[PDB]
C-alpha cells in the first residue's frame, strides 16, 4: 500500500536525487576525448550585404582548428537549414545579414577561451541596407526587400506573388456570416491588442556536443532538444547520413520552455565542424546570444472585435492579426497551422459565428514566435478573447463576470463544436467560475473597489485597485493524424514497457522532459495500471537509439499523447497477464477479475495470481499458446486534443504616482481532468504564473529604428526574483477528458496562457474608471506612470 505511489500520489521526484547533488548530466557537463569548442562571429548589423569576411588572422591563431563561413557550407547545401514552418533560415550568412547578432562565421578552437579570442580577429566588411523593424510598414510599396534568397520584389498585394515581405495569409471561419452579424449588431466592440515580443529564456541556454566518428561513419549528437527524434530525422534529411547512424541524445535539460524545439545554426555548425575535423565539437551559447538569436515569443498585433446585443449576448467575433516573424519564418507549429491554434480565440463562450485572419510578415529581427508556454499561439488567442470580454463589458456597462456567465458554453453542450472548428472535449465552466468567485469574495471586492475609487476622486488615496479575471479554455495534446504533423510526421507519441523476470520495469517514451517530472509521473501511470510499485519502474527519454519514436515535449502534449500511450501499453501487458493467469489457474480469461495487483477467479477470490507472479511465469513457464516475456509498445494517435480550462482572479493595487503595481492576491483554479501528481501540477502552476507575471508586468525584447536589439540581457530583461514574485493560491476542479485513457488533460502551459490576461486585465481594470482604454503590455512602472500622466493624475 505504502510502496505503490501510483496515480494521484504526491510522489516525490526521482530526478531530485541527482540534481540536488550536482550529478545531473547537462550538455556542457559532457567532456569527450579531443573535444574542441566552437562559437560564432556575429553580425553587428541588422541589415547589410556582406562584402568580405577575413578569417586569416583567426585561422593563424594558435589553438584554432577551423573557421567556417557560408562558403564552406554551400557545397554541402547547408548554408540554409529548413524550419518547422516550411521556410529556410540562414546557417552562416552568405550574401547578407538580416538581423543583429546573426551568425556569420563559426570558429572552432581548443577551448572556449581561445575561441572567443579568435572570434574578435575575424573582420567582416558590410554594406548597410535600409532596416525594417515596424511590421505595420512591412508591406508598404517602398518596404525593403529582405528575403532576396526566396522572394523577388513585389510591392503591393495584387501581384502574382504576395508582397515580398508577406510570409502567409491564413483565414478560418465564416466570413460572410460574421460580416453580416457585425453589420446589424446593436453593439460592436473593437480594439487592437498587441502581445509584445518576449523570450522563453531557459536558465540553461541552447547547446550541443557533436561527435562524428569517422572510422565508423556514425554521428553522435548530444543537445538541448525538446524533440530529439525529430532532430535526428532532420539531421538525416539534410546531412545524408542515415538515421541508424545518427545517435541523438537529449540528456538532462535545464529548462526548455519552447526555446529548444527547433534547430539552431550552432547545432548545424558543430556537426559540420565535427564531420570535417573528425573530433567532437561543443557549442554553448551565452545569454546575450540566447536572448537575441533564438526563438522569441509572441509579437502579435490583434485587431479584435466582438458583436453583441445591448443585454450582453455575444453574437460573433472577428479578429485579424498581424504577426511579426522576424527575418526567417522559424515558427514552430504543426505544418498545416501557420498561426498555430490561434483559432481557439472564441474561448469559453458559445458564439454562433466567427472569423479569423492572420498575416505573417518578415522584419529584421530574430526568428521564432511559438515559444514560452504558448501551446501554439493559444497565449495570443486567450489574451485576445479575455481582453475583448473586458472591453465589451465596459462598453455595455456590465460587470465582466456576469458577461462571461451569460455566455459560457454549458456542460451539457460538450463535446462542443466551436465556431472556428475545434471540438472541445469536456468542461464545467459555470461551476469553476462560481467556485472562484466565491473563494475570492468577488462581489465584495467590487464594492470595495467602488469605495476606493470614490476615495481616489476625493483625494484620499493615490492607490487604485484592479480586479483581473481570466476564464480560459486551453487546447493541448497535438494531435490527431488527420491534421497535426511536424514536417510530415504525424503528431502521435509512444511508450514501450518491458517487465523483467523479477518484476521490475524499464519503460521509455517518445517525449523529453526539461523539468516537468516525467521520470516520476510516467511511472505512476504504470504503477496504477499494473500494481507494480513506482520505484520498481525506470523511466527514460531522449536517446533516439533506445526510446520509441516520438514527437517530443511541447504543446503540453506529454500527458495527452505519451501518457495515453503509457496507459495503453500497460493495458496490453495487463491483457497478456490475464491470459497467463487463465493458463496458470485453469480457467477462462472471462472468469478472472483484476484486483489492484492480481487477477482473481470470480467467486473463488482465494485463487489468484499476482502481477509479480505473472511476470515470472512469462519467463519461467510461458503458456505454450503465447510468446515468452511480458512487454508492450503503443504508438498513440489521439482522437482529439484535450481542452483543460481555468478560472484565474488577480487583485492588483497600483500607485498612480510612480506607476508601481503590487499584486495583492492571485487565485488560480485549473482543471486538467484526472490529476496524476498534484505536487508536480502545483509546481507547474507556480512556475507558469511567475512567467505570466513577468510577461505582463515587465519583460520585453525590443528593436530600435536601426535594428539594434534592446534589452536582451539580464541587465534589463525582467526575470523576477523571490522578492518580486507573488505568492500563488491554487485550486482545481476535475473534469476528465472523455477520450483519454486515464481522463488526463495537459496542464503545463495553462498558467501562462491564462495568467497573462489575468494580470493585464487587472491593470486595465484598475484604470477603467478613469477611461484609460486598452493599456498595452508590459505594465511596468514607467508605462503605468505614462498612463496616469496622460489622464492628468499628476497635477
Amino acid at each position: 500500500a505504502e510502496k505503490l505511489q501510483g496515480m494521484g500520489c504526491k510522489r516525490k521526484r526521482v530526478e531530485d536525487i541527482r540534481f540536488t547533488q550536482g550529478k545531473g548530466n547537462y550538455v556542457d557537463d559532457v567532456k569527450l576525448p579531443g573535444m574542441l569548442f566552437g562559437d560564432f562571429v556575429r553580425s553587428s548589423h541588422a541589415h547589410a550585404r556582406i562584402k568580405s569576411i577575413d578569417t586569416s588572422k583567426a585561422k593563424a591563431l594558435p589553438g584554432v582548428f577551423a573557421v567556417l563561413t557560408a562558403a564552406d557550407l554551400k557545397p554541402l547545401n547547408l548554408h540554409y537549414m529548413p524550419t518547422l514552418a516550411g521556410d529556410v533560415q540562414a546557417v552562416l550568412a552568405d550574401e547578407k545579414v538580416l538581423f543583429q547578432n546573426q551568425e556569420v562565421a563559426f570558429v572552432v578552437a581548443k577551448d572556449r577561451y581561445v575561441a572567443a579570442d579568435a572570434i574578435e580577429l575575424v573582420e567582416v566588411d558590410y554594406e548597410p541596407l535600409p532596416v525594417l523593424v515596424d511590421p505595420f510598414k512591412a508591406m508598404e510599396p517602398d518596404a525593403p526587400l529582405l528575403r532576396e534568397d526566396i522572394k523577388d520584389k513585389m510591392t503591393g498585394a495584387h501581384g502574382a506573388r504576395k508582397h515580398h515581405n508577406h510570409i502567409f495569409r491564413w483565414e478560418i471561419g465564416d466570413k460572410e456570416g460574421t460580416d453580416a452579424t457585425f453589420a446589424k449588431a446593436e453593439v460592436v466592440s473593437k480594439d487592437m491588442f498587441t502581445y509584445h515580443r518576449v523570450h522563453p529564456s531557459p536558465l540553461e541556454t541552447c547547446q550541443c556536443v557533436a561527435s562524428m566518428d569517422k572510422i565508423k561513419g556514425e554521428l553522435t549528437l548530444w543537445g538541448t532538444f525538446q524533440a530529439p527524434h525529430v532532430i535526428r530525422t532532420v539531421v538525416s534529411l539534410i546531412s545524408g547520413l542515415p538515421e541508424h547512424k545518427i545517435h541523438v541524445i537529449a540528456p538532462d535539460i535545464g529548462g526548455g520552455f519552447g526555446n529548444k524545439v527547433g534547430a539552431y545554426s550552432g547545432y548545424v555548425c558543430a556537426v559540420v565542424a565535427s564531420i570535417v575535423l573528425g573530433v567532437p565539437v561543443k557549442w554553448v551559447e551565452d545569454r546575450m546570444e540566447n536572448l537575441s538569436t533564438t526563438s522569441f515569443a509572441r509579437d502579435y498585433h490583434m485587431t479584435t472585435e466582438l458583436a453583441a446585443t445591448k443585454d450582453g449576448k455575444i453574437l460573433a467575433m472577428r479578429c485579424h492579426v498581424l504577426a511579426d516573424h522576424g527575418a526567417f519564418d522559424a515558427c514552430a507549429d504543426p505544418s498545416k497551422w501557420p498561426a498555430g491554434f490561434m483559432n481557439i480565440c472564441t474561448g469559453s463562450y458559445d458564439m454562433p459565428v466567427a472569423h479569423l485572419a492572420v498575416d505573417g510578415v518578415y522584419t529584421n529581427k530574430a526568428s521564432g514566435g511559438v515559444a514560452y508556454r504558448c501551446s501554439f499561439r493559444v497565449t495570443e488567442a486567450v489574451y485576445a478573447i479575455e481582453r475583448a470580454i473586458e472591453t465589451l463589458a465596459q462598453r455595455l456597462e456590465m460587470d465582466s463576470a456576469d458577461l462571461r456567465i451569460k455566455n459560457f458554453i454549458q456542460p451539457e453542450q460538450f463535446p462542443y463544436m466551436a465556431p472556428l472548428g475545434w471540438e472541445y472535449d469536456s468542461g464545467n465552466y459555470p461551476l469553476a467560475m462560481k467556485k472562484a468567485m466565491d473563494t475570492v469574495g468577488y462581489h465584495q471586492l467590487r464594492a470595495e473597489q467602488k469605495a476606493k475609487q470614490e476615495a481616489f476622486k476625493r483625494g484620499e488615496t493615490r492607490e487604485i485597485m484592479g480586479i483581473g479575471i481570466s476564464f480560459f479554455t486551453e487546447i493541448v495534446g497535438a494531435g490527431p493524424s488527420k491534421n497535426c504533423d511536424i514536417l510530415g510526421v504525424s503528431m502521435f507519441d509512444s511508450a514501450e514497457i518491458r517487465i523483467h523476470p523479477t518484476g521490475s520495469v524499464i519503460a521509455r517514451m517518445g517525449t523529453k522532459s526539461q523539468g516537468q517530472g516525467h521520470e516520476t509521473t510516467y511511472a505512476q501511470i504504470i504503477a496504477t495500471e499494473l500494481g507494480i510499485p513506482a520505484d520498481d519502474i525506470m523511466i527514460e527519454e531522449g536517446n533516439t537509439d533506445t526510446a520509441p519514436y516520438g514527437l517530443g515535449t511541447y504543446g503540453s502534449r506529454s500527458t495527452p499523447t505519451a501518457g495515453a500511450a503509457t496507459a495503453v501499453a500497460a493495458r496490453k501487458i495487463k491483457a497478456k497477464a490475464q491470459m497467463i493467469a487463465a493458463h496458470m489457474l485453469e480457467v477462462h480469461e472471462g472468469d478472472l477479475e483484476w484486483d489492484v495487483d492480481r487477477f482473481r477467479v470470480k467467486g473463488l477470490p482465494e485463487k489468484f495470481k499476482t502481477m509479480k507472479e505473472l511476470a515470472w511465469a512469462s519467463y519461467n513457464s510461458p503458456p505454450p499458446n503465447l510468446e515468452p516475456g511480458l512487454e508492450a509498445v503503443n504508438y498513440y494517435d489521439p482522437p482529439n486534443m484535450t481542452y483543460p480550462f481555468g478560472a484565474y482572479f488577480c487583485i492588483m493595487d497600483i500607485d498612480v504616482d510612480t506607476g508601481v503595481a503590487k499584486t495583492r492576491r492571485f487565485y488560480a483554479l485549473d482543471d486538467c481532468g484526472t490529476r496524476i501528481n498534484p505536487m508536480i501540477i502545483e509546481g507547474q502552476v507556480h512556475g507558469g504564473l511567475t512567467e505570466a507575471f513577468a510577461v505582463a508586468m515587465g519583460q520585453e525584447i525590443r528593436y530600435d529604428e536601426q535594428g539594434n536589439v534592446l534589452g536582451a540581457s539580464f541587465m534589463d530583461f525582467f526575470l523576477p526574483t523571490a522578492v518580486e514574485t507573488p505568492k500563488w493560491e491554487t485550486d482545481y476542479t476535475v473534469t476528465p477528458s472523455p477520450h483519454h485513457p486515464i481522463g488526463a488533460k495537459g496542464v503545463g502551459e495553462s498558467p501562462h496562457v491564462g495568467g497573462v490576461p489575468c494580470f493585464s486585465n487587472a491593470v486595465n481594470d484598475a484604470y477603467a474608471f478613469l477611461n484609460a482604454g486598452h493599456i498595452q503590455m508590459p505594465h511596468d512602472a514607467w508605462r503605468l506612470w505614462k498612463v496616469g500622466e496622460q489622464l492628468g493624475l499628476h497635477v
Partner: protein, 158 residues
C-alpha cells in the same frame, strides 16, 4: 600561468591557471565539478554560486587566481561523507523546490550560507536572502518551503 593552491570540498587542489580563467570555468572544466552552472553573462542569476571562505560568491565574477588559498564548497561537497543528504538537499526534494534542476546547486549553496547567517529566517528574510538567485521553473514558492523545512531539521539536530 599562475600556480594556485586551494581547498575544494575539503580536498587540496593545486593548479597552473591563466589569470583570466574565471573561477566557474576552473571548477567545471579543470576540476570537473560540473554541479555549478552558468546561467548568464552579466552576474545576475546566481547559478554559479559557491561557498568561498564563508561567503556566497558568484564564481563567474571572480578569477581562479583570486581564489588562491581559499576554501571552497560546491554542491558536490554538501552531502555527508556517508552519502546522507544535507538538510537543504533533503528539503528541496521533500518540498518540490526544483524542476529542471539547473538553479538548484546555486540555490542550495546560497541557502547553506543564508542559514548560517540567520538560522531561523522569516519568509521575507528568505526571499530577500536569495535575491541573487534566479529560478525559471518553480516560482520560488516551494524554494521558500524547502529552506524552511531545512531550518527546522537543522534546528532539531543539537
Amino acid at each position: 600561468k599562475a600556480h594556485i593552491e586551494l581547498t575544494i570540498n575539503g580536498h587540496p587542489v593545486e593548479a597552473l591557471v591563466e589569470p583570466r580563467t574565471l573561477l566557474i570555468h576552473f571548477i567545471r572544466e579543470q576540476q570537473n565539478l560540473t554541479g555549478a552552472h552558468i546561467g548568464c553573462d552579466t552576474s545576475h542569476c546566481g547559478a554559479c554560486t559557491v561557498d568561498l571562505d564563508g561567503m556566497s560568491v558568484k564564481s563567474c565574477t571572480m578569477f581562479a587566481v583570486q581564489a588562491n588559498g581559499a576554501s571552497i564548497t560546491t554542491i558536490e561537497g554538501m552531502a555527508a561523507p556517508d552519502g546522507t543528504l544535507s538538510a537543504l538537499q533533503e528539503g528541496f526534494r521533500m518540498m518540490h523546490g526544483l524542476q529542471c534542476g539547473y538553479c538548484t546547486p546555486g540555490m542550495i549553496m546560497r541557502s547553506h550560507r543564508l542559514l548560517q547567517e540567520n538560522p531561523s529566517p522569516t519568509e521575507a528574510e528568505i526571499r530577500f536572502g536569495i535575491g541573487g538567485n534566479l529560478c525559471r521553473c518553480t516560482g520560488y514558492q516551494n524554494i521558500v518551503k524547502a529552506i524552511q523545512y531545512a531550518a527546522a531539521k537543522i534546528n532539531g539536530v543539537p
